[PDB]
Design a binder for this molecule. Structure first.
Ligand SMILES: O=C(O)c1ccccc1O
Ligand SMILES: O=C(O)c1ccccc1O
Ligand SMILES: O=C(O)c1ccccc1O
Ligand SMILES: O=C(O)c1ccccc1O
Length: 150
């Protein structure tokens, strides 16, 4: 439900990494479900974890989602006691956001499970550390272009 909720050489090349996304999320889905959190929620949670104290404004910008989407997901994170909002009289979109203790516990647990699952996947392949850094090198080049464009 989580993965479901979330929804030429150059051609074979792009296909090789774009088609891995969905299978990847299906496999990591249970990690989030076990913590009663959905993928959209996890991404914003993680984002806050790494940038807190942060704001709906900054979040929307780094995540590249629309305010309505970010507002709705944050609202669920708050309602679930995973993040706390600075109490202020300013606009909600300007208020500082940080993880609650429950939020941190959930975060550390998901993060470690994901890390171990990734290690496992790799361990079943013939991929070398070198092959991994070379891939990283190529992907970041692609990523630079897609972002500078936007
Ligand atoms: O950046 C993503 O789109 C993403 C999606 C699901 C899980 C981890 C991720 O980084
Ligand atoms: O970083 C990921 O690839 C990831 C995947 C599934 C759930 C949480 C995550 O951070
Ligand atoms: O990637 C995100 O930060 C995200 C968050 C909520 C809903 C959809 C999304 O892609
Ligand atoms: O509902 C809130 O308290 C809230 C707080 C910060 C950002 C968006 C929000 O909906």
């Amino acid at each position: 439900t989580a993965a479901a909720k979330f929804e030429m050489l150059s051609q074979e090349f792009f296909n090789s990494f774009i088609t891995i996304y969905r299978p990847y999320l299906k496999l990591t889905e249970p990690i989030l479900e076990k913590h009663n959190i959905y993928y959209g929620q996890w991404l914003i949670l993680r984002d806050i974890a790494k940038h807190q104290p942060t704001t709906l404004i900054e979040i929307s910008h780094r995540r590249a989602i629309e305010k309505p989407t970010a507002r709705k997901t944050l609202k669920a994170l708050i309602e679930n006691d995973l993040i706390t909002v600075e109490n202020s009289l300013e606009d909600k979109r300007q208020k500082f956001l940080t993880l609650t203790p429950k939020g941190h516990e959930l975060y550390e647990i998901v993060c470690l499970d994901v890390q171990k699952l990734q290690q496992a996947v790799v361990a079943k392949t013939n991929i070398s550390q070198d092959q991994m850094q070379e891939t990283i090198n190529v992907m970041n080049q692609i990523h630079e272009i897609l972002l500078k464009e936007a």
